[PDB]
Symmetry: C3
Subunit: 129 residues, 3 copies
């Protein structure tokens, strides 16, 4: 059976009809994450701070199920202006992953997000026990 | 190997180049579902009911492969107006999952779906 | 654990903060694919030719990892105009999959994709060794 990932003091705290993610055997599915502060639930200022924080939130949920950034098998980034934020996502991923290797990834533009945010991400990880 | 989930009296019937979903080892991958009637292909009337049909469709298909709502590891819900429909989604989810627990999800706005619908869901499950 | 799919003489060459795809246990995840020429990275001319190309790149990557079109457990197709392109996709899927059986899929309109392309695809595959 899946195990829903319980919220942690490093992690988002779900405030509605959802979970932060689930462990399912070897796989870990993180729900949509965005650049909110875990404590207040409010969005962080700054384009790059926002996106870095979206990644950190996602990675925390993952790490709370035993997956690391090196276990990512798919990232789906939805943003609000691909022309504008694709380079930011690039820059933030260079910060996190260094020179690689990088996970498979898809970046799409979309009209509206959780809360009017600029970016939301879906992460799926493979982390055998 | 994977096994394509074959249509059912509880299930939607595929009308083109796709399947309802597939079982792959321990997992179940349901393709996109709209809030339509399994028997007519007409989009069921009215917001609340439509969004509930969507889930009920998705969940029948999951059921055809031996997956229950308690098995959802991902829901991706695309809607045509997020401000107007997440409340409806949130509400349909409470009806189905009660107080808890709930699957991971992501809810996005998309400018169009096939045949001018308001909502579409992608579900992934673990048995 | 996870195995990044390395570029190939049949395959696209990553050039940015991503990989063509990954194999994890029994599954293969391919990142976003466009209808570009594997060698030049230029987008192919022609609606149908392009959507054919997009598909062909996705499967070339999936094969580099031991998966065939008969292994497809989910296709998510992001297009710029559902009305003008659902049919093109149906046609291309006929040409490739013949009478089937066809994979589970979803087709979405989306205001923009990177590079200004009209379509992009996400394939997930199941191919136990």
């Amino acid at each position: 059976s899946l195990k829903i990932i319980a919220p942690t003091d490093k992690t988002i705290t779900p405030s509605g009809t959802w979970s932060i993610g689930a462990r399912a055997g070897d796989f870990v599915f993180i729900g949509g994450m965005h650049g909110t502060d875990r404590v207040t639930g409010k969005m962080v200022d700054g384009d790059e701070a926002r996106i870095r924080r979206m990644f950190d939130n996602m990675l925390a949920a993952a790490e709370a199920a035993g997956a690391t950034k090196a276990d990512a098998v798919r990232l789906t980034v939805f943003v609000t202006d691909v022309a504008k934020y694709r380079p930011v996502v690039n820059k933030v991923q260079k910060d996190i992953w260094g020179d690689g290797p990088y996970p498979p990834r898809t970046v799409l533009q979309v009209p509206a997000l959780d809360q009017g945010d600029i970016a939301e991400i879906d992460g799926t990880f493979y982390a055998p026990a």
